[PDB]
Design a protein around this ligand. Structure first.
Ligand SMILES: Nc1ncnc2[nH]cnc12
Ligand SMILES: Nc1ncnc2[nH]cnc12
Lengths: 205, 199
């Protein structure tokens, strides 16, 4: 698309979202998201294509932000969290001798740390899978919260060398349309991230 | 590069790891290494296809081959893929049919375009997990792999047809011979292409 890119303090940011349901009025003020589709395969295919188009066009983003909703039985409902680490729960190679969650012939740990921490936002570990998690298990999930996209976004970003930052509001898992609150709290978090970008969020030392 | 030309039609062979690729296959083609699992496959193939599209070029067919598990079909035999489903997809709690991706218009089971004479056919299920023992019971497809559905969506995104091929490694009530049988299947497929299968 390339018209969906937002420039903040000389840096180019790309926001990606799964479905239009999560995209509300408050977020609409901040940016225009690339619609990434639903699930790990849709997310991986769509984002890898977009990033490949942008790279060969020299149009590459400095930061990709994956944001949307998530479920949790652990975390307070209707609160926004930044993703500290992500894992892929659909991946089990254990019958052949691999630790659960680890992908063969790929040097990555089972839990992949995301590079960034923005002040003023809670952190949470995330699990990505093609299933919507409900009721029990849950207790089969080690991560704090669950989504269908982020890990697929990560592998796409790592493939082209762009860093990734996640943001997730909790829409369910205590037992929906609460997205109105999710959209407002997510916009508040986005404001803090863009400020952090201006403050040098992308930089070593 | 890794693409093979047959009768003026361009074929791209993709596999997960070294694995199922032996001497008999080596003589026929040099496969793209697509990685293991639906996420690795989708990212790597979408990237490769995007590089090939803007440089197009582009393939007229993508051949996804490698091993598969089955609790149903005989071991050490090769099957072309009649259809493919994504077993990790469950949207049912919010009302979608189990195995169906929201906002995509596709059935839970997606038929593949081509059938080649002289080769057994089977349905395929893909997911990030290795299916073993008791886990086979809830799987409706004849056999299971970790890649092909990801390949399918990657191919569909750029508008290229896909052909699956699978040897049975495990489950399989009663990797050496599989390499020989996949090679025999590939040969029949290439001949099939020379006969106008890609019309
Ligand atoms: N329960 C859930 N499981 C997976 N992804 C989700 N996104 C929002 N709620 C979810
Ligand atoms: N048993 C198995 N389960 C899943 N994918 C496979 N690919 C080959 N064998 C497999």
């Amino acid at each position: 698309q390339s018209n969906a890119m937002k420039t903040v303090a000389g840096k180019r940011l790309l926001y990606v979202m799964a479905a239009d349901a999560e995209y509300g009025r408050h977020l609409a003020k901040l940016f225009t998201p690339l619609m990434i589709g639903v699930g790990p395969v849709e997310a991986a295919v769509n984002l890898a294509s977009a990033l490949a188009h942008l790279k060969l066009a020299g149009d590459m983003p400095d930061l990709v932000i994956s944001l949307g909703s998530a479920g949790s039985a652990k975390l307070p409902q209707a609160e926004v969290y930044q993703v500290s680490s992500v894992s892929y729960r659909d991946m089990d190679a254990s019958p052949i001798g691999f630790e659960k969650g680890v992908t063969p012939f790929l040097d990555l740990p089972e839990t992949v740390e995301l590079p960034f921490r923005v002040a003023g936002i809670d952190t949470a570990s995330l699990s990505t899978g093609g299933n919507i998690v409900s009721g029990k298990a849950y207790e089969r999930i080690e991560a704090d919260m669950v989504d269908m996209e982020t890990y697929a976004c990560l592998r796409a970003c790592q493939a082209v060398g762009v860093p990734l930052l996640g943001l997730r509001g909790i829409s369910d898992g205590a037992s929906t349309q609460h997205l109105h609150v999710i959209d407002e709290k997510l916009a508040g978090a986005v404001a803090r991230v863009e400020r952090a970008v201006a403050d040098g969020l992308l930089s070593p030392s």
